[PDB]
Design a protein around this ligand. Structure first.
Ligand SMILES: Cc1cc2nc3c(=O)[nH]c(=O)nc-3n(C[C@H](O)[C@H](O)[C@H](O)COP(=O)(O)OP(=O)(O)OC[C@H]3O[C@@H](n4cnc5c(N)ncnc54)[C@H](O)[C@@H]3O)c2cc1C
Ligand SMILES: Cc1cc2nc3c(=O)[nH]c(=O)nc-3n(C[C@H](O)[C@H](O)[C@H](O)COP(=O)(O)OP(=O)(O)OC[C@H]3O[C@@H](n4cnc5c(N)ncnc54)[C@H](O)[C@@H]3O)c2cc1C
Ligand code: SF4
Ligand code: SF4
Ligand code: SF4
Ligand code: SF4
Ligand code: SF4
Ligand code: SF4
Ligand code: SF4
Ligand code: SF4
Ligand SMILES: [Fe+2]
Ligand SMILES: [Fe+2]
Ligand SMILES: [Fe+3]
Ligand code: NI
Ligand code: NI
Ligand SMILES: [Zn+2]
Lengths: 228, 280, 385, 228, 280, 77
């Protein structure tokens, strides 16, 4: 019954695919668990209804008149606006773009939606793992925010280098060389030279998963409840 | 104190090979190897043995023979957890069990709680094993001890262990020890704030402390780990004697765990008083 | 007894604390010199990172003797890679190193001038060093991109080669500079004797090391001879061993002082030894450098290519590049495997010195003792990196 | 007569050298233009006098007890504390460091001094060009802050990728492809692919000169007065 | 309006070669080339000619013959200013003069004011020349015009110029024009906020607008530039006729400059109203 | 194992994406791409799709388009 809305401004669309990944949940889930409205991909109504939460796949583009126009509309329409996938949350690979590729050589600038409009929560990943996306939906559906405390916090996150866990953590002297953050690389750009993480930029999309998954970056004592 | 646990025991694996090469108990290698038999775990990721001498590089071993090669203790960062994505992905493993320091261990559980871009991995770990770590040091930090302090090559030490109140290097024809107070500068800046001496998160936790030499004390934090352990003891791989009965008293281990918390807590106050960000 | 600690010792790059044990007369007995600067950790940071990076990160190790560091790193890397600089490319490197020796020495004089030169003179003295310093920079920056921290030198070549118009513009500047530098040293040479520090000051029995008067030869070096040992062994005190930030590099198990004084004795023939001698050596040393400067400059191809193309992915094999930094011998060893450095080690000229410096400050009343240390003109940032 | 103090916590020391570069000024300048006190490099008094401004060469290191101890002292001693050279201002190449190189394998963390203590102004560069450093000193000596408005602003700057002018400017759609920022690279890491700046990380020290020198990043109309 | 200036003139360089290949006036090439004779500038950095067709890549030419090759107009980003460090540094140049769009020009002066890590460069530029730019477009943005709009190869256009109210492509055997209103999407997002139609910063500024075809109007912003110009006119390289006298009226140029400011100003209000940072 | 620094020569790689033919051409010079072009299966289609939706009542017409199952993100990149 709760209405979930997902609008993909400019996204590889992996994020949507990840959503379909949680198969066991999925077949029932659209039907029973959640109501999906105003998804151009998943539905065909052109103008958005008020929606309990809005999921925005991709970083907005300043130049495109429509994307900007749509984003402004979205804030009123969605009681809660959540940006998911790095491309909405951090701007992701988009940042590397320098415009000037035809057609439309002009479109060169893309920014995380978050900068344009306050966003309640963004969960990043390229795409976000299907499970996290399912866990949030059940959480959002089941209305618990102890769980989503980390994400509400993550909405702020925006720019994120691979480079940054080095500035954000290893520099702080926080890093203990556990290796968790390298494992959380979709790109596989990060790897551990003894024993700290060393990453090679040629291959980093700035998704931000490594800053997020370091135990050091923020420790929830929420989980302890989950195991036991 | 200890993290909430199902039971505390001090145990040794039965097998001659595990006793021969296992650092203490030989429980991690024995517990991990048995699971392979039972098949609860398809493979596990165990640090070592690295390109450098006494340098651990994490490796996922399906083979029991391989686990035996892994078994031993190397006091350096081995980022075990990097493997987990790699092990599940290519040597495809439905359920994989890994040996994790408390530190790594902190890193995995949140991830299981908050995958955030780990796909399907999160379900896959079946038994995670936590090893108590007071502190651990960079390879170079370690290297100095063995040489400036003990006057031995990195090659010579067959095994290195930190005995209570001391650091022990075992080399053919000798054993060499230096005081921990000697050790104090070297361990990583990160560990300064590591709260958990025992592995509270880990399903079963194994440590040398609180058990006689050659005996390892294994504390079972969670039910799945407990089950695997109960099965192994039934197997008779491990000889188990309740912890309280055997000196040193597990109260001593408890005291050690407490000391660690006191150390963490002030450090955090100092870091908190100072500008620089802190988790925790 | 009583031990007096000077920290950090003044007038030298970085921070080192000298600790002294003295008899009642105050004649010192054990002199300990260690570098207390925090390690910026370049040797480690470079590892697992690309070859292309290694020269850029490494030169930041020391912004005074940046050109020697860059040269050493490239040489070590090119050697591990096996690139061959074309002769013009090789000549440009030597030309830059010479300009750098000249400049670096001048900077040292500015620093130690206050003890040496009367105040009435000093404003004039300082001005001259700036004058000599300013011309030399023109060559280092012009050949090598901006210097200090020139970014132009690169693996297997030089980024670009100076135009004949540039080379000509440079030459007059170097050739014209030659009279001033010649006079400047004499005034410096004249000043140093006047001070008359007690003869027999700063004499040590330690062996000197030199590869080449300017550009360093890798071949004249022994990995077999060389060894490095951590201060923890070398130092007397647990406190001091722990405090010291610098590894001591041992030649044939003997602490070694490498310097212009050392570079002269090995190559020029410089029988005299003293602290006054080290000072004298610094002057004549720039004197020699500047010559090569103009020498290489007159005979420069100016159209011959600088770059030699090379394959970055490397054989595991390690290579050593040794070049003479203004403060003494320097070597960089690197092994490139998979196109990213696997082992990187740098021994900087000061590093060699720091063990020898403490024994040097023994005997003569300690007020003297910092004078000995300052003569070595150590730059710690180099010593520790 | 005005007292300038420069304390180099952990710096390649280029910054000091740049200071000596302005030769024509320099010989007179220490003598007439400015008074230098408590510089270990340039002077030999161990405990610092109050100083009108303090110039701090290098990024502080958390681990080293002395550097931290010294920094706290510095704030009282210097009526104005200015961090110069990227290594004080942005943390510069230091950021790349992962500790664990002997001796002292422990020291792994370095942070721009600015984060530890509020800093009145930082002028970055590795080193700062001699002229800028001279211009500020005359400015500081001659007490004009219309000029130093940009620097007071720059004190905030801290972390700076090469990567960032792409996020900071090219993404914003500000960039016009003038090429000024590439010219302002000491490293030479930046170079212009048509027509935007493309930089290669293997070679960037995070000095921050490129963000600062883009005309787009901040335009002073101060200069117009200077020419005419 | 125009930036404060010493004088306004419309002039052409005398030489047949400059008239032959110069876009308008041939003043930039003529003024730059003359300086070489006089020696005020050792060398100048002039865009073109790039690897692509009609693609400019900046090059520093000591040679006058070289300047002639450079002379022409290519409406694409050529980052002239990248060279300046390179030109001064290797082909060592005590004083170097460069041709800069107003845009680049904005970039240099602050740098001369605030070197901030440009060493010694700042003094070295002797004469900087500013060329009025309404807007300029990415090579691809440009490429579309020549082909979708004009149906010609990039090879064929000998010269391309934007005539008043039109875009002109000159190809052997033809001239092809399309309206500017056609052009409106393509120019870079950055230029949307470029205030200065004329080069206010530049020492002397040259533009086609406000002068008859083949005549270039040069406005001297600063005294050094003025001096170099006065010297050249004395040289007789340039035939100069006061601007006001010759239609179109420089008032028209002034109007064009004003229009640009109106365009910049609102764009900034919109950018300012919106979150995204703005200089200016 | 391969050498990254490349001859100027361009090469084409064509593989069949679920939505239709795909090719990538790249030229590597100096170990950094100099020209890169991608034609994605949808790109080929988009011109043909408009002529396809002609004739039958338009309510049908989106049905034709949807049959091609185009993914734009591919078509535009
Ligand atoms: C860094 C470190 C510090 C420790 N500190 C203490 C202590 O203070 N007190 C104490 O009682 N016990 C400590 N331990 C563990 C203890 O020393 C024994 O190693 C272990 O708990 C007993 O298991 P076992 O007897 O079966 O030995 P084994 O059968 O040899 O088990 C050892 C296992 O540890 C794994 N391992 C080795 N090195 C690492 C590493 N760097 N990171 C992650 N895993 C690794 C190997 O895969 C091996 O499988 C520490 C272990 C480590 C790695
Ligand atoms: C992008 C651009 C837009 C312009 N828009 C206008 C306009 O709207 N109205 C107008 O009257 N004039 C404009 N001009 C300048 C004008 O068209 C003439 O090019 C010039 O002002 C007259 O000088 P000249 O007659 O001596 O020609 P030339 O002697 O040919 O001088 C041309 C010089 O311009 C330089 N140049 C060419 N392309 C570039 C570039 N992309 N960036 C920097 N420098 C370059 C070349 O080095 C050459 O030396 C523009 C120029 C450019 C580059
Ligand atoms: S977040 Fe990742 S998967 Fe999602 S649209 Fe962006 S790049 Fe594609
Ligand atoms: S998770 Fe954090 S501390 Fe652990 S290895 Fe990765 S970066 Fe280092
Ligand atoms: S290193 Fe990997 S996880 Fe981190 S931001 Fe880059 S791509 Fe993402
Ligand atoms: S002391 Fe803490 S941070 Fe250090 S290795 Fe042990 S568990 Fe990890
Ligand atoms: S700012 Fe640059 S020159 Fe100065 S100490 Fe830091 S790295 Fe060296
Ligand atoms: S200065 Fe700014 S706009 Fe100009 S070329 Fe460089 S990055 Fe692009
Ligand atoms: S690109 Fe160059 S200027 Fe920019 S931060 Fe890197 S090194 Fe500095
Ligand atoms: S319109 Fe403005 S920003 Fe664009 S090229 Fe001309 S001067 Fe530069
Ligand atoms: Fe070293
Ligand atoms: Fe395409
Ligand atoms: Fe040096
Ligand atoms: Ni040095
Ligand atoms: Ni597709
Ligand atoms: Zn970055």
């Amino acid at each position: 019954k709760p209405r979930i809305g997902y609008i993909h401004l400019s996204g590889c669309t992996g994020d949507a695919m990840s959503l379909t990944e949680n198969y066991d949940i999925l077949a029932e889930l659209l039907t029973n668990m959640v109501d999906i409205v105003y998804g151009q991909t998943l539905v065909d109504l052109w103008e958005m209804p008020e929606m309990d939460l809005a999921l925005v796949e991709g970083s907005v583009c300043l130049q495109d008149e429509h994307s900007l126009h749509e984003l402004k509309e979205l804030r009123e329409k969605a009681k809660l606006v959540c940006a998911f996938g790095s491309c909405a949350a951090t701007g992701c690979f988009t940042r590397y773009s320098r415009g000037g590729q035809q057609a439309q050589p002009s479109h060169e600038s893309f920014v995380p939606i978050a900068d344009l409009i306050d966003v309640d929560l963004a969960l990043p990943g390229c795409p976000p793992s299907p499970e996290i996306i399912a866990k949030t939906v059940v959480a959002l559906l089941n209305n618990d925010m102890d769980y989503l405390q980390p994400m509400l916090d993550l909405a702020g996150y925006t720019e994120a280098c691979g480079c940054d866990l080095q500035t954000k953590v290893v520099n702080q002297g926080l890093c203990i060389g556990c290796g968790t953050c390298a494992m959380a690389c979709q790109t596989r750009a990060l790897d551990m030279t003894n024993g700290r993480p060393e990453l090679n930029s040629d291959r980093c999309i700035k998704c931000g998963i490594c800053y997020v998954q370091c135990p050091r970056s923020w420790w929830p004592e929420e989980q302890i409840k989950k195991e036991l | 104190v200890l993290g909430t646990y199902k039971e505390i025991v001090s145990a040794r694996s039965t097998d001659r090979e595990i006793q021969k090469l296992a650092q203490d108990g030989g429980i991690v290698t024995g517990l991990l190897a048995y699971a392979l038999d039972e098949g609860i775990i398809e493979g596990a990721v165990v640090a070592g043995p690295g390109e450098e001498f006494w340098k651990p590089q994490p490796m996922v071993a399906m083979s029991s023979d391989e686990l035996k090669a892994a078994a031993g203790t190397k006091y350096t960062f081995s980022p075990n957890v990097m493997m987990l994505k790699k092990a599940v992905r290519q040597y495809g493993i439905e359920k994989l069990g890994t040996v994790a320091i408390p530190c790594q261990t902190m890193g995995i559980r949140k991830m299981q709680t908050y995958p955030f871009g780990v796909r399907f991995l999160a379900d896959k770990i079946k038994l995670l094993v936590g090893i108590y770590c007071m502190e651990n040091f960079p390879y170079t930090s370690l290297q100095t001890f063995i040489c400036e302090k003990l006057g031995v090559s990195m090659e010579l030490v067959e095994k290195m262990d930190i005995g209570k109140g001391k650091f022990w290097v075992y080399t053919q024809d000798d054993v060499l020890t230096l005081p921990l107070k000697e050790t104090h500068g070297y361990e990583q800046a990160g560990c300064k704030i590591c709260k958990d001496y025992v592995a509270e998160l880990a399903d079963v936790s194994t440590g040398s402390v609180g058990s006689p030499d050659g005996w390892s004390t294994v504390i079972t934090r969670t039910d799945a780990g407990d089950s695997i352990f109960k099965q192994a003891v039934e197997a008779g791989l491990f000889e188990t004697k309740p912890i309280e009965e055997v000196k040193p008293g597990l109260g001593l281990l408890e005291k050690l765990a407490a000391q660690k918390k006191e150390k963490a807590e002030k450090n955090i106050a100092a870091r908190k008083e100072m500008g620089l960000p802190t988790p925790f | 007894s009583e031990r007096i600690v000077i920290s950090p010792t003044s007038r030298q790059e970085g921070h080192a604390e000298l600790v002294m044990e003295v008899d009642d007369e105050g004649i010192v007995t054990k002199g300990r010199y260690f570098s207390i600067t925090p390690v910026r950790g370049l040797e480690k940071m470079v590892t697992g990172k690309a070859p292309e990076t290694a020269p850029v990160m490494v030169q930041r190790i020391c912004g005074v003797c940046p050109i020697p560091h860059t040269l050493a790193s490239v040489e070590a890397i090119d050697d591990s890679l096996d690139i061959e600089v074309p002769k013009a490319g090789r000549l440009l490197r030597e030309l830059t190193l010479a300009a750098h020796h000249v400049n670096s020495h001048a900077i040292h004089h500015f620093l130690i001038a206050p003890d040496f030169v009367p105040e009435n003179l000093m404003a004039d003295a300082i001005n001259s060093v700036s004058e000599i310093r300013k011309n030399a920079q023109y060559v280092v920056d012009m050949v090598a991109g901006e210097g200090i921290h020139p970014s132009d030198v690169r693996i297997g070549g030089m980024a670009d080669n100076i135009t004949e118009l540039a080379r000509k513009r440079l030459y007059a500047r170097l050739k014209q500079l030659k009279p001033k530098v010649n006079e400047h040293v004499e005034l410096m040479i004249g000043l140093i004797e006047d001070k008359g520090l007690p003869e027999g000051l700063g004499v040590h029995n330690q062996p000197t090391l030199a590869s080449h008067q300017i550009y360093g030869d890798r071949t004249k070096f022994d990995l077999d001879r060389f060894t490095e040992i951590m201060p923890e062994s070398w130092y007397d005190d647990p406190e001091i061993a722990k405090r010291a930030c610098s590894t001591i590099p041992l030649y044939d198990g003997r602490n070694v002082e490498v310097g212009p004084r050392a570079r002269m004795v090995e190559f020029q023939g410089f029988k005299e030894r003293g602290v006054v001698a080290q000072h004298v050596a610094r002057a004549l040393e720039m004197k020699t450098a500047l010559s090569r400067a103009i020498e290489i400059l007159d005979e420069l191809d100016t159209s011959a290519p600088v770059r030699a193309d090379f394959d970055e992915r490397g054989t595991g094999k390690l290579g050593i590049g040794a070049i003479e930094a203004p403060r003494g011998l320097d070597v960089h060893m690197a092994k490139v495997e998979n196109g990213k450095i696997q082992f990187y080690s740098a021994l900087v000229p000061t590093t060699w010195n720091i063990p020898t410096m403490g024994p040097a400050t023994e005997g003569f009343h300690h007020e003297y003792g910092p004078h000995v240390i300052r003569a070595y003109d150590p730059c710690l940032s180099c010593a520790t990196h």
